[PDB]
Amino acid sequence: SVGGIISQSFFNGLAGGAASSCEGKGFYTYNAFIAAANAYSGFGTTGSNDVKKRELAAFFANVMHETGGLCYINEKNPPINYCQSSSTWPCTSGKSYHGRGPLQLSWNYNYGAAGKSIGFDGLNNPEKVGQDSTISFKTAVWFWMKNSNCHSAITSGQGFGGTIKAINSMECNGGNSGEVSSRVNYYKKICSQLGVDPGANVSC
Which entry of 66, 75, 171, 179 is annotated as an active-site residue?
A: 66
User: What are the contacts of 46-49 at 24+ separation with CB within 8 A?
Assistant: 46/151, 46/155, 47/155, 49/5
Are 153 and 162 contacting, i.e. CB atoms less than 8 angstroms apart? yes
Q: Nearest-5° angle of CA 62, CA 81, CA 37?
A: 30
Residue 5 backbone dihedrals phi, psi, to 5 degrees: -90, -45
Backbone angle region of 76, left / alpha / beta, with phi > 0 → left and psi within -120 to 50 → alpha: beta
66 noted as active-site residue: yes
Of 68, 106, 76, which is closest to residue 89 (Cα–Cα)?
Answer: 106
As annotated, the active-site residues are: 66
